[PDB]
Design a protein around this nucleic acid. Structure first.
Ligand SMILES: [Mg+2]
Ligand SMILES: [Mg+2]
Ligand SMILES: [Mg+2]
Ligand SMILES: [Mg+2]
Lengths: 126, 210, 156, 97, 60, 92
RNA sequence: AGCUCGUGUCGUGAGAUGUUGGGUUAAGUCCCGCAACGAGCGCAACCCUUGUCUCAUGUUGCCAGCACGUUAUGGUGGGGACUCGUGAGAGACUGCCGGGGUCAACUCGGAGGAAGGUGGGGAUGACGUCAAGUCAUCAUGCCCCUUAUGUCCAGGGCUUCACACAUGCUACAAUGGCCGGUACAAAGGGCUGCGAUGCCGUGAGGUGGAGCGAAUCCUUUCAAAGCCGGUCUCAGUUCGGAUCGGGGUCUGCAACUCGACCCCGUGAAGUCGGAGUCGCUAGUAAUCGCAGAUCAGCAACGCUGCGGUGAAUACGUUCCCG
């Protein structure tokens, strides 16, 4: 069996792409029970929307860490890597949308003496 | 004078070692108390004798001291008059025995603390601080497996009132470079007018030490 | 970016149920500090109300309203030789669309109606019909630009 | 999740503890786990040194406390005893989550 | 601040009202912060040596 | 290659170097090449090459002419200044 | 990002060169030059965290393939091919091509690539100005007190108040309030501390123990914003919660002056705010909560770290300040 990995800010995911009926069985929860925002559904379908294979291939993912959007991005990256390893001809169809690479944008290290990252304390003139 | 951070205090867990390497639950307080007590007791003696580093370790209810003397013979005189005397003093001041074990250094000019002690003694002996620093730099750069040196004697130099801080350097003394293995020495000299600060830096070599 | 060059446009995918980059930009603008799904539902309800009211394509009506309220000239302020001049400069399509969306969302939040969905629906309807606060502000900006047209010869 | 949310006082100490744990468990011959990447945090220490007007040069000097974790599954009493018999460093203040 | 007074004040005192600091390092009854139970001198000594649990000074 | 901004103000060392190079070039006619240390021969070769590359004016005139044709006065600020301080005649 | 130094060169001398003219960046980083030659404090790198892959090993994590199980959980055997928190190696070095540029540094685009042109973020604070902060961390030259200004004790004060300034929280309402049902994050506080099931409680909580110098235990087999249903009908109100009265709780002998929390009633200002002004360039602002430093007991809405969901702009340096 083929298996890949997807990473995010503070989340990881491992999937095994196999043919069958389109479904997303998460760790104890289903697709609608894990993506209730209705935007993460579209986000994780985008890899399967550029190439119409939503109801053609299965997705049995196992993830850990992060939140809704993080898990959505991790599953998207995992599906992208699986499509890269299975159908190389469809690789550009997924790269054209901004996939196949983990966005370097992540949570940075907060600074000292400040309220948050890149935020100086407010002070009035005198 | 400047806001430069102590290289030893910064690399105490990267390059340099720690003078107190032990652990204890609720007894670290008494451990460091006995440590500073022994330090205060040996201050005058080992300063008149020449001291570089006092590494103290804690064992099962006993102590393990290692003092780095520069001039052996003053502290180690007659067997039963000076060494055993200080040992008994430490033992009766603390609540345990003391198996004192002295370790001799390889070169007094290579240790920063010893160079600072020597230059401070020279300054207190009513000599030219400039010439003293120059001769100390020469001794520490006479190929003692070194590559750079920087000596500074701040405070009321020459018994004056202005806080003159003569910045004297020789060779390569980088402070921002981590792979330096630079030894540092901080000393406080006491004169008839006030206090004086002595800051020394000895860049031995570019050894990784990983 | 600032003083370095332009920025790369985000290759955002078209909306799945509407397929309109303008609609997605309006959603991203009306988004309230993380209320993604809430803003999506609000815009969907507003478009559904506009459809029930008019009887045509919501995306086409929104595009028509945006094209009608698009400001073709925005005034500025530049000091040339120790004297402030409000010279009007040619605006770009992206900047004009962003300003139009900003004015639209502002006047929709300012409108006093029952719900935000109804507010946005009525704002879009007024912008499409040509009688709304957005159209009034567009006309005011056009009048200001025509009045300040006297000083436009630099193009620096 | 499990194993673990702990904290240590020295990076050297904690990495040596992890190494010796791995060594003793491998010598018992049981097993190992799959490490995963996770960074450390910056502890909360911004204490003053004097109650006087020291409000310039005031804030802090970070106390570096690096922490590492090692997950485990499928318990076995033999491994339990081999891991709970003794702790060589004893300075890593482990806390159960 | 001697051994006798330290031992008399650390354990159950005669009257409960006697609940002062009574540091263990120097022994002084007052001038010590119960935040750490140590007199400022040794407190800062350990802070600079890197032994007290989490105390430091200027870096900003 | 390199214009020396001292040929007309500090001609002492310039003339010394010129005489040394002339003596070396005249001795080269003898044939004393292998009768010298290798490092010294290499240092010689290098200095002679640098000279021959940076010297094309002092080997022909030797008569302090009264005319100069300069170019790129923007970067040759020292050259134009020296020309103006040693004589008004300058063609830039 | 500048500060400099040894020699040399010119001036009687203070001093001039090195640091003056260009290409380019963050650099006084490089080179062409340049009576200068080299070096130091500088910058970068060396160090830390994250991004891809590989090896030594498959732990009270995962369970894919096999099975044993009943729901409050991979709970129990067997499984490396799966995210390599311990060590190392590979991968960014303008590596190659083109337009270039003085065919010298250096700029843009392209191929592979996770990052392409110090990858994203920090540690890293030079000579020195503010006669900068500290003699209450400590030492400290000099003066002063000593039956005192040393020390303890009981009470009070630092928490007072007809006002002003500074920083944060609550909000001012429908992207809302209340009730019922629901999913993932990292970070641990624990030995005289954490403390799950139960008894009874509107609720702090009275009973208490399986379990802990470290995954059997709370902080849940992890929260809020987030999703579904009902209701309020857009108002000084089911928004907001303060003062105040009645019924109590956690600590310690002692809580109006002397913390916090719960139940009932009481229901004030606040309708997004003028003159002025602050912070923010991508995981940033915004918004939400979690945890900790010390305490037997908290003024903690503060200070530090954490991540959930996560936007619009970037003509340009004419212009306010450095
Ligand atoms: Mg002279
Ligand atoms: Mg100069
Ligand atoms: Mg003053
Ligand atoms: Mg109203």
């Amino acid at each position: 069996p083929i298996q890949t990995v997807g990473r995010r800010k503070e989340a990881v995911v491992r999937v095994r792409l196999v043919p069958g009926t389109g479904q997303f069985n998460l760790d104890g929860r289903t697709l609608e029970n894990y993506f209730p925002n209705k935007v993460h559904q579209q986000l994780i379908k985008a890899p399967l929307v550029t190439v119409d294979r939503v109801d053609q291939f299965d997705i049995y993912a196992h993830l850990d860490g992060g939140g809704p959007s993080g898990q959505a991005g991790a599953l998207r990256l995992a599906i992208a890597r699986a499509l890269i390893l299975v159908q190389p001809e469809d690789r550009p169809a997924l790269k054209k949308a901004g996939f196949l690479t983990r966005d370097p944008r992540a949570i940075e290290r907060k600074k000292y003496g400040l309220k948050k990252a890149r935020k100086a304390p407010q002070y009035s003139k005198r | 004078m400047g806001q430069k951070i102590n290289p030893h205090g910064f690399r105490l867990g990267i390059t340099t070692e720690w003078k107190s390497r032990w652990y204890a639950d609720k007894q670290y307080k008494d451990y460091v108390k006995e440590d500073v007590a022994i330090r205060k007791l040996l201050a005058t003696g080992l300063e008149r004798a020449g001291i570089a580093d006092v590494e103290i370790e804690r064992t099962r209810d006993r102590v393990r001291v290692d003092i780095h003397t520069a001039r052996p013979g003053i502290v180690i005189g007659r067997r039963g008059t000076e060494a055993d005397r200080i040992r008994a003093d430490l033992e009766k001041l603390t609540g345990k025995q003391v198996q004192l074990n002295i370790l001799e250094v390889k070169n007094p000019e290579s240790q920063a603390q010893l160079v600072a002690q020597g230059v401070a003694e020279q300054l207190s002996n009513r000599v030219a601080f400039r010439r003293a620093m120059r001769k100390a730099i020469q001794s520490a750069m006479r190929q003692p497996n070194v590559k750079g040196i920087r000596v500074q004697c701040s405070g009321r130099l020459g018994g004056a009132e202005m806080s003159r801080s003569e910045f004297y350097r020789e060779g390569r003394v980088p402070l921002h470079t981590l792979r330096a293995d630079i030894d540092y020495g901080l000393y406080e000299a006491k004169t008839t007018f006030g206090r004086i600060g002595v800051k020394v830096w000895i860049y031995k070599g570019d050894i990784v030490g990983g | 970016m600032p003083r370095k060059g332009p920025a790369p446009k985000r290759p955002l995918v078209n909306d799945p149920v509407y397929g309109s980059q303008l609609v997605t930009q309006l959603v991203n603008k009306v988004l309230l500090e993380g209320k993604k799904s809430l803003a999506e539902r609000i815009v969907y309800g507003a478009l559904e109300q506009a459809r029930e009211k008019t009887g045509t394509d919501p995306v086409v009506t929104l595009k028509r309203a945006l094209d009608n309220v698009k400001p073709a000239l925005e005034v500025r302020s530049r000091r040339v030789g120790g004297a402030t001049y409000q010279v009007p400069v040619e605006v770009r399509p992206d900047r004009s669309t962003t300003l139009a969306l900003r004015w639209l969302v502002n006047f929709s939040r300012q409108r006093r109606e029952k719900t935000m969905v109804e507010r946005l629906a009525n704002e879009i309807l007024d912008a499409s019909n040509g009688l709304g606060a957005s159209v009034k502000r567009r006309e005011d900006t056009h009048k200001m630009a025509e009045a300040n047209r006297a000083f436009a010869h630099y193009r620096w | 999740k499990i194993r673990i949310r702990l904290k240590a006082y020295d990076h050297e100490a904690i990495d040596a503890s992890a190494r010796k744990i791995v060594e003793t468990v491998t010598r018992t011959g049981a097993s190992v786990v799959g490490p995963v990447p996770l960074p450390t945090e910056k502890n909360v220490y911004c204490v003053i040194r004097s109650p006087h007007k020291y409000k310039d040069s005031r804030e802090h000097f970070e106390m570096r406390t690096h922490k590492r974790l090692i997950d485990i599954l499928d318990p076995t009493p033999k491994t339990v005893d081999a891991l709970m018999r003794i702790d060589l460093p004893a300075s890593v203040d482990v806390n159960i989550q | 601040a001697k051994k006798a007074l330290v031992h008399k004040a650390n354990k159950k005192p005669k009257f409960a009202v006697r609940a002062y600091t009574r540091c263990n390092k120097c022994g002084r009854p007052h001038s010590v912060y119960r935040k750490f139970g140590l007199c400022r001198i040794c407190l800062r000594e350990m802070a600079h040596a890197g032994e007290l649990p989490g105390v430091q000074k200027s870096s900003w | 290659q390199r214009w020396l901004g001292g040929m007309l103000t500090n001609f002492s060392t310039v003339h010394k170097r010129l005489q040394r190079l002339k003596e070396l070039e005249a001795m080269e006619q003898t044939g004393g090449f292998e009768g010298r240390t290798k490092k010294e021969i290499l240092m010689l070769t290098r200095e002679k090459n640098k000279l021959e590359r940076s010297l094309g004016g002092i080997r022909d005139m030797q008569k302090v002419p009264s005319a100069v044709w300069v170019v790129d006065t923007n970067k040759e600020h020292i050259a134009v200044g020296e020309a103006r301080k040693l004589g008004i005649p300058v063609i830039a």
